[PDB]
A paper describes a structure:
[name], a member of the type-I or meiotic clade of AAA family of proteins (ATPase associated with various activities)11 disassembles ESCRT-III polymers from membranes, which might be coupled to the membrane fission reaction itself. Proteins homologous to [name] and ESCRT-III are also present in the Crenarchaeota phylum of archaea where they catalyse final steps in cell division, virus budding and vesicle release. [name] contains an amino-terminal microtubule interacting and trafficking (MIT) domain that interacts with carboxy-terminal peptide motifs termed MIT domain-interacting motif in activated eukaryotic and archaeal ESCRT-III proteins. Here we characterized the oligomeric state of the [name] homologue from [name] (MsVps4) that belongs to the phylum Crenarchaeota.
Residue numbers in the entry: 97 to 212, 216 to 366
Amino acid sequence: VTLNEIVGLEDVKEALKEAVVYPSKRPDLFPLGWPRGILLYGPPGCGKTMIAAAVANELDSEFIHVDAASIMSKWLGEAEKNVAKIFKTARELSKKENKPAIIFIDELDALLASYTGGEARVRNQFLKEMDGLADKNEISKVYVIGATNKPWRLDEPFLRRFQKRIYITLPDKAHRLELLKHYSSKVKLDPNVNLEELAELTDGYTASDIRDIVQSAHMRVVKEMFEKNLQEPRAINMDDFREVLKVRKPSVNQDMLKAYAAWHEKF
Ligand SMILES: Nc1ncnc2c1ncn2[C@@H]1O[C@H](COP(=O)(O)OP(=O)(O)O)[C@@H](O)[C@H]1O
């Protein structure tokens, strides 16, 4: 919900401010126009969804969450209906409240995965809608924020509608620390717990991963409590984490990270 709740992504936040907020707030200062389709790409659970909602919140604009997998329906014309409805709703909401409307589409790549054209005809209908967003005469202000963990699955026709493209990265050593401080903050830690060390040990783990680690480590003492009929749980100690790390790997493999940085190298 807010930007300030999002750990890293200081430069992402700025790119979305610059692509969406400042134009919405001051169109008169953008006499050379600006893109309305913004691609967030990266590994899973690193804040593509959060960052999109956080902007919608920053604007207090309407926010419309769609899963691309859900709109691709195996009947001709239901999918078309879906894609038309989305943008229509967006435009109406924008026009009614006189402020922007943000469509967040996650699993975007799923628009290129086959079901029954037909799926091409839906795709092209979507892209037509995209192309329609900047049209000068429309009083509604609609932005599409598209998200995918497999940007490489997007073809050229589809990529050209997304002119702004931000890489949302794994959390770095410093940021993982903030993440750990943040998640761990609501549970009882042993003094022997060294968050700096754990940040080091969590190289390659996604923000959601980190959350799941903390939960899982909290689970060990809670499990103990109940098993032993105690009133509160034992504190979470440094071992507790090591144990859970022994079995939990990064959600993203060394190849994927290259896939991403390669893809990033273009486009
Ligand atoms: N940068 C971040 N700061 C704080 N929490 C994060 C961050 N990235 C991910 N998370 C956590 O992981 C969950 C999934 O994040 P999400 O925004 O869905 O990213 P993605 O679209 O990449 O899956 C969030 O609900 C949040 O708890």
